[PDB]
Amino acid sequence: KAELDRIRRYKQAQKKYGRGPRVDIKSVRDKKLRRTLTNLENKYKTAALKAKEAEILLENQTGFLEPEGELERTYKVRQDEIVKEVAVEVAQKKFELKLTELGPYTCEYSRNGRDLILAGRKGHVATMDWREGKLGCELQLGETVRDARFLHNNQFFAVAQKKYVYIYDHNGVEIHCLRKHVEVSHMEFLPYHFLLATLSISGQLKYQDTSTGQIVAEIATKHGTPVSLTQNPYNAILHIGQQNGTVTLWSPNSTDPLVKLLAHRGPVRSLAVDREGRYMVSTGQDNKMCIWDIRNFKEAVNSYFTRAPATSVAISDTGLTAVGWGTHTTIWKGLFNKERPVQVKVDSPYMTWGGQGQVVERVRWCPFEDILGIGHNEGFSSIIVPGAGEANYDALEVNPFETKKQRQEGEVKALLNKLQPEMIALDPNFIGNLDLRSEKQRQAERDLNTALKKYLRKQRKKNIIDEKRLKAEELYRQM
Amino acid sequence: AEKDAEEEELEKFVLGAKETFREQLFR
Amino acid sequence: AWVADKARFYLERAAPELREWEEKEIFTKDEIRNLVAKRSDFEHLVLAPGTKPTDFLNYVNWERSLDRLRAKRCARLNIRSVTSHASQARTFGIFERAVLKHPGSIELWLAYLEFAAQVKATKRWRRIMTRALRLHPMNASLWTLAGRRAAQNGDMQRARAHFLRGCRFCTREPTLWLEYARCEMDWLARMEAKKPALSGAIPIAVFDVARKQPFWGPAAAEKFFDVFAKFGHLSCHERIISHVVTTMQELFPNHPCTWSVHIRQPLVGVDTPAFPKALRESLARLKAALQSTTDRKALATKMVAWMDGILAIEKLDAAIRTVLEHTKRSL
Amino acid sequence: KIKALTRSITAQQAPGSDVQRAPRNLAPELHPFERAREYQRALNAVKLERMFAKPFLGQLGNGHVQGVYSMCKDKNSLNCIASGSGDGVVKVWDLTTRDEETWRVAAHNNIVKGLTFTNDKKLLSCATDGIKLWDPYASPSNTTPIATWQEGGPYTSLSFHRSANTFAASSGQGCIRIWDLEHSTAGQAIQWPSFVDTITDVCFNQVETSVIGSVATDRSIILFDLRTNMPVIKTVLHFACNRIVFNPMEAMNLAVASEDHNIYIFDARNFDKALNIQKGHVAAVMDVEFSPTGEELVSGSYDRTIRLWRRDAGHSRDVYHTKRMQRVFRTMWTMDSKYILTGSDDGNVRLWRANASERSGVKATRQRQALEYNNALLDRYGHLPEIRRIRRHRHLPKVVKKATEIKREELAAIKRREENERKHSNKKYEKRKSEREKAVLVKQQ
Amino acid sequence: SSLAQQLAQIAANSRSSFNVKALKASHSKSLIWEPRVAVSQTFAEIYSQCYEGFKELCHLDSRFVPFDATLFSAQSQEVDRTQMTAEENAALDKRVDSFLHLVGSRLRLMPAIKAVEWLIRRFRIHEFNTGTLLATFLPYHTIPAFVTLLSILPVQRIPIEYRFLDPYIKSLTPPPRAAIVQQATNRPDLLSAISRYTLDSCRAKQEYPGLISFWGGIMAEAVNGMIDKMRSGRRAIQLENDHLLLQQIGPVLSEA
Amino acid sequence: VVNFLLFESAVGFSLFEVVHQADTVGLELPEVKDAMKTLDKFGKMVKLRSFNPWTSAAQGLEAINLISEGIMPEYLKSALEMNLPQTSGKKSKVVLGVADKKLAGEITAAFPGVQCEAADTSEVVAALLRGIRTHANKLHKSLQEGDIGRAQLGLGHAYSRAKVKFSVHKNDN
Amino acid sequence: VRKLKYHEQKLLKKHDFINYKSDNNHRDHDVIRRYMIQKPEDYHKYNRLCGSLRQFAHRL
RNA sequence: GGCUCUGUGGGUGCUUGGCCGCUGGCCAGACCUACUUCAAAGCCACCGGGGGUACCUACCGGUUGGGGAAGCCCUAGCGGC
RNA sequence: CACGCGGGUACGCUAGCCGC
């Protein structure tokens, strides 16, 4: 019939924007509760339906490339062919920085992709606006540099020196150094909480609140130096990856790991985790990489193999992933589809960047454009890959063209809605659920032959006599 | 053709003429 | 400027019509992306701070042409399920915030009245006409549009309501008074052709009240006669014309306009043996007028203008034509 | 078939316009921590309303000399108030110019017990002297009354009809008596047939005309039908009731402010049980008044408190207090249903606001949307522990806090005594009588 | 500062604006309107005024009617040049060079200046076709319209051969024929660019006597100064200088 | 509770229709005073309903010399007949807000269904007409032909000269 | 960050991006800048030496 | 003819190739996603001085309710210490 | 209840019978 499209529309919107199963109105016994819950179910149904109908006003289109003939394959496509076939405002972004004498470089974009920071190993830390081509800062620092990271804006950044971390302003003037964070080898900035989480080489993980300036919870990961660290963008829990070959999930409200996904036989070399929090791809020292469903904590498919222990892996805003191993990175497209209940293995990579003798230190996706920045020992190299990048951003959350007034107002609103670090769990939507023990105690204070042998075995050891045990002795004598 | 000239004029006014702009470019 | 958050509502309102057009085969997806971008640019131009009635009219014309294009395409693809009601509702919304922002622009008020009359909205047209008349009460064009459309509908009491309030306001220029006498005598002609009214005393009353107005000149009374002289096929037309002539003769005795109405009086309903008889009577009046003591240059310019109006018609005799030329040339 | 996503800055600003275009994608992958960010915004909303909760607005004029023992608004106008004090002087105030009174007169000898406005422009006042009528709005000011009434015992309160020129005065002889202005002199005295105790308050029902409620010091409420001039029903409660009032949107609901520290919302058709029991006070409740929207209540108590209530709440939405406010005798709304007025025993008429953190005037759209968003967010997440403790914290004076701690101890002791007597007496095999059913002692006709 | 040098080359080679102040400045650069008015102008106002100018130009000369369909189109109100591919940009460059060769004869007139203002304010010809635009305004280097074009030109977008114009951009005065002739005798690239522009026009038969007299005068004075430079007195150096002069001249004179 | 309000200025007289009327108890409050200051929060209160300009400076001179003396003019009666809903005050009235008390009495005597509130007596309509006099240049600018400054200048000169009889005994220049 | 409003400041009472409480009133930065120390490591080395010297005086 | 400034190439250490998934290939690349038996041994791991300790965390010792690896025995079991 | 396109009774018009 003609209403079949209507029922399909409602099923699709209840899948996507529904955020829950539905309230069962037939089991409600109260009359006023029944009509108010029917009113609420009508309002939530039209809410999801109007969001799905207003998903037509999205402006941009997702990029792609598809092979035409039967012999042509997508991984044999050259960057010169992409640059010839693509528009000029996005063919401008395929550059290459040639910085040779100051260590392998480490790239990190800001979370709108306006400014990128690249840090050499021997000290050369620079901060540039890579589309407009101007550099905001460049400074040399002397000693080694473990990791450089932007903070909430492109105003402040944070560099991990030989002992401490240092946070710097937009001009590069050093605001301060953090002395509690010694020998920091990895850093990750939670964006919605204002926490900066640092793994030392000793295995200690410190969460420092950036806004107010006090370290929230120093967790000591009891086993080994950590090899890698990433951050779930959906839970804000930290997937750190150890050297015995397990990845452990950490949160500032517990000193034990939340889960520990057992992984590759050697140490895991790199991790990456989806921005919807669905799946995690990890690459180990044993040459395999493998993906996990995170919402169920099981392995999705068999282990893919990489032909070298992959130094970095970073997955995009859409389904693409760049796994950078040895001296050339490969991009895979369909590793984890959200819609499929049982995942299938991908035969061929989506596209491969060339191996011409520059060992890849770190690959990163520019968060809203369809490019990929590889930081290697010869410097920085930005390549363009069409399928990646979220085509339609939201101007309220994060904006690639944010003016000065919009940046000021957004920083103040993010300060006002910074989340307390005790609001971190495996499921981030728990706020308002039942304390079941407290509800059972409230209802209690409102309404007011195989185990009874191990009972006596446990209570003969106290040796309190405790009249319930006298009743249990009489029961055992009767038995 | 199965389109009126008034319908093609309304299509060029309302909807845009990007395809025939590219056609007028590549000559 | 909260213009992004302000135009979000109008785009989210126009979205489900685009969903229906995409789920039918009428507009393809690239064309619907073009419609989305064009309506978005138009809304962010319309709800801007510094805006213009030409900008509102460009948006109105685009939405109305989109409705016409979809009507042509729907008739070509043979669908009857898609209706034009949402497009007419959003066009009325554009026009309502247009007349909210710029109420002092009669071009936009008249475009609103033309749109509401064209898509068959008579009651809405009357409400828009009332608001436009309240904002521009000195506008004779708006008053005549209201009165003539109420007479065209046939509600002569409402047409008289609009016209009498209009003649209460617009008393600087004669224009609305002439149009009211024209509408009242057209009602008299409708009352005759349907076969008080038998007397037809209302244009005489209009003349008698118009005698004391701030526009009351001999040229204005000549404009009254030039209005009255059309559609002479009536009953009391000779009564009205004779009262106009005796009023002008008793008030402005030796004006060239009064001599012109003395010339052109006896040719009321003539087109035919009664035509040259009354022409010879009028030419006797004209020769007496030319020899008489009046401003001969002014009377001659009036007569050569009326003689161009005479020469505009065919089907006459050449001797009469050449004697009109001979009497014309020496003026 | 290569195509990558190209973003011009035309998607942020079209050239030639100052409008910053804000494209929005509502997909949930882009907006993480939905429930957590909304909890943080609700917590900010509670802390913001506790910061901007500033309810005291002003004080009408210099006040009175002795305390304000009666006051009455004009239910037709919007800025006409009057207040009669304890030294028997009445004042008519205009709420637009609160600097000085509009019209004052040394009305009576004793305190002014009741006071009201007529529907034309004139006002009436009771005393133990007898009731009087003045014209406070006249082109010469006249201190002398234009009518007076002494026969009918000692009068206690007044209530004027909604439409006509009828009014009922509650006397101390156990009767009310009803006058119609301009053609009645002594009025008609309606009484319960053998009734002796004084009728304290009287209130015309404004929705249903010709239904009159009254309380009396027999701890009883009585009704009256004016169409057939007789009493209707009489129920005896447990404690004395200070004041009856009706709901201006629901014709059948009434509220009695009673010496049980309590407000009882009753149904006039079924006096079996109370529809609601508002319990929050410390000393006796002196005055109760429904909002003109019919969904809220003010109660001025005999300790130093005003308590603002919702209609279905059963506990305080707000409490207002002040060291200068000595006792509270008469509280009533303005007809805006936004500001409340308080006639105290310090001789002061004070103007507070209900919705203490909500400022008046015209708001911009992004201002009133932020306020409505905060209110909806508190309606959802108002029961969580942090949000709950910050939204319930209010600073009470030390006497009221100490006495409500004593009242909690005494009520818990009485509940424990009753529960022990139930568990060890023969009442154990009965259904527990609900508290709204226990609110009424007897009902009789 | 090798990184600052690489980023300076990237920022100079970049073409599309990426922040709001850059978009407002690049939209503010105009020929006719002052910048305070030219910031706040949509592409319907510019198209109305400059299409009145193109209607006057198309009524003057007959051969502007293909540009009526491709460059001055109501759809060409909306086309962004930085969002099309390289072959679309190259075909647009060919259409612009053909229009500039066509409009060079009438460039003292306000209709033609309005048409060039449409090309500048929509397709950004002062940034993407600086060579052909500067060459077609070079025979009019004594006029205020050339002073305004010199004012709105970007500095690093000028070709290397026309970099004598930098003091005349720093101080807004029209450059003299002595400066153009002296840079023509010093650089072979400027003389080759002027001769290539006028021969590419004259092969398409869009010549005009102002351009012909301009090229003839500047190549005459440039060959004069070039001979006076090439003269050396040493036999082998004057032989090599005569050979270099003929290798720099020969194609131009062998065609003209 | 106001429904409409008259407002007479030198270019003519316009009557506004109030929607979302002003709070009368919090008139002396700082937030409501800031709302009466800002045009973005007072144009939500007033919406321009009708405008009647003068035909000539002679009509403007007759308008002042009637209005200041108190008596209403025939064209003000005309525009009120046109804009106000025709009632008699037996079951429904219309509240108009005017600046002067004598003009209030005369409009109420000419139209029995219109109850007039004077700005000299009522503080609500006083503050509301005060806000309209504040923002009177921007509320009319869509139909304000020219300015108001030269109109007020020439009209004050014409009114003062008609009151003084200046030109008949000033001759020395 | 812009200058915080009244209510925004009252909600962010304990907030400043520049000086924390672990920065020790930027005493390190003020002393390094005053005495032209080209190494913050040299400041903190001198400071830990002075701290060991002060605890020796404390045990004496 | 001279000063200054700038650019490129070589040199400023002793001469064995460019790249790769390197015993072989490629420099025009080719094939693309396999194969699998048993997670891991422990320790250390740099914050300036004196002081406070309500709350959080670390360590140590306990308390209720559940849980049972392993050790021991035999009336053999859904076992028992 | 009616709302698109055609031929009809009829137009400086669209009110009425049947279809596409």
Side-chain angles (χ1 to χ4, degrees), chain A residues 296-308:
Chain A
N296 291 307
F297 292 121
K298 73 194 176 192
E299 194 184 9
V301 280
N302 319 330
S303 298
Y304 298 87
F305 70 101
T306 72
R307 305 171 177 271

Side-chain angles (χ1 to χ4, degrees), chain A residues 152 156 164 166-167 174-180 208-214 408 412 415-416, chain G residues 1-2 4 7 11-12 14-22 26 29 40 44 47-48:
Chain A
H152 52 98
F156 311 118
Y164 321 113
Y166 287 67
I167 79 163
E174 165 202 340
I175 294 171
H176 50 265
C177 78
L178 306 175
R179 317 252 299 146
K180 320 290 173 65
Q208 169 144 0
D209 204 340
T210 290
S211 86
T212 178
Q214 44 199 30
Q408 289 169 14
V412 176
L415 277 171
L416 278 188
Chain G
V1 55
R2 74 178 183 199
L4 267 46
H7 67 274
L11 297 180
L12 318 164
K14 251 166 59 179
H15 164 265
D16 198 10
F17 276 122
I18 302 303
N19 43 358
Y20 293 168
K21 204 160 294 301
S22 90
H26 296 292
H29 294 127
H44 295 296
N47 191 29
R48 89 168 63 230

Side-chain angles (χ1 to χ4, degrees), chain A residues 44 61 64 68 390 416, chain D residues 1 3 7 23 25 44 380:
Chain A
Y44 287 169
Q61 271 203 340
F64 69 103
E68 300 92 2
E390 191 70 269
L416 278 188
Chain D
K1 284 190 180 61
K3 162 189 182 163
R7 286 172 192 191
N25 193 2
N44 281 342
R380 177 172 289 180

Side-chain angles (χ1 to χ4, degrees), chain A residues 172-187 189-226:
Chain A
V173 45
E174 165 202 340
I175 294 171
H176 50 265
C177 78
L178 306 175
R179 317 252 299 146
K180 320 290 173 65
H181 298 178
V182 70
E183 276 184 349
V184 167
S185 85
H186 289 277
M187 286 155 46
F189 185 72
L190 318 182
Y192 285 89
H193 320 267
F194 273 161
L195 272 51
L196 179 82
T198 82
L199 283 174
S200 312
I201 308 189
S202 41
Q204 198 160 2
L205 166 73
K206 307 223 181 63
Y207 287 86
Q208 169 144 0
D209 204 340
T210 290
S211 86
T212 178
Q214 44 199 30
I215 55 173
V216 161
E218 66 195 20
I219 289 158
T221 79
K222 288 292 190 304
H223 42 103
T225 176

Side-chain angles (χ1 to χ4, degrees), chain A residues 17 19 44 58 60-61 63-65 68 86-87 192 234-236 275 368 386 388-393 395-396 399-401 406 416-419 423 431-433, chain D residues 1-9 11-13 20-28 30-33 35-37 39-41 44 312 380-381 383-384 419 432:
Chain A
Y17 298 108
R19 295 177 180 89
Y44 287 169
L58 261 51
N60 292 290
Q61 271 203 340
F64 69 103
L65 60 88
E68 300 92 2
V86 84
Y192 285 89
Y234 164 75
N235 306 114
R275 63 186 281 270
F368 280 123
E390 191 70 269
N392 309 108
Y393 61 96
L396 290 193
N399 201 344
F401 324 102
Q406 287 181 344
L416 278 188
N417 300 327
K418 70 180 289 292
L419 283 69
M423 305 149 76
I431 296 180
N433 292 346
Chain D
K1 284 190 180 61
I2 303 173
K3 162 189 182 163
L5 61 101
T6 76
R7 286 172 192 191
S8 61
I9 180 163
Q12 161 81 9
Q13 289 185 359
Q20 318 264 358
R21 189 157 320 178
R24 299 217 45 241
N25 193 2
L26 302 149
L30 279 145
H31 305 289
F33 305 97
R35 213 173 297 180
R37 272 200 289 177
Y39 175 82
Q40 190 62 222
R41 293 169 175 178
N44 281 342
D312 48 38
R380 177 172 289 180
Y381 301 98
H383 54 259
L384 291 165
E419 181 55 46
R432 276 97 190 272

Side-chain angles (χ1 to χ4, degrees), chain B residues 8-18:
Chain B
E8 287 179 1
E9 185 176 1
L10 281 175
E11 184 179 1
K12 275 187 180 173
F13 168 60
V14 174
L15 192 146
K18 183 146 260 175

Side-chain angles (χ1 to χ4, degrees), chain A residues 84 86-88 92-93 95 97-99 114 118 124 126 128 131 133 135 401 403, chain E residues 2-4 6-8 10-11 13-16 18-20 81-87 89:
Chain A
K84 274 183 185 172
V86 84
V88 61
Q92 279 172 45
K93 297 173 198 173
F95 50 87
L97 265 45
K98 292 182 178 192
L99 317 156
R114 267 300 272 277
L118 53 92
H124 185 249
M128 62 210 63
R131 312 174 181 186
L135 84 171
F401 324 102
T403 53
Chain E
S2 197
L3 188 46
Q6 278 144 344
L7 286 174
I10 279 173
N13 279 186
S14 72
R15 291 167 164 82
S16 84
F18 282 121
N19 57 316
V20 165
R81 198 170 144 126
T82 49
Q83 275 188 343
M84 299 177 297
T85 60
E87 67 272 338
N89 213 351

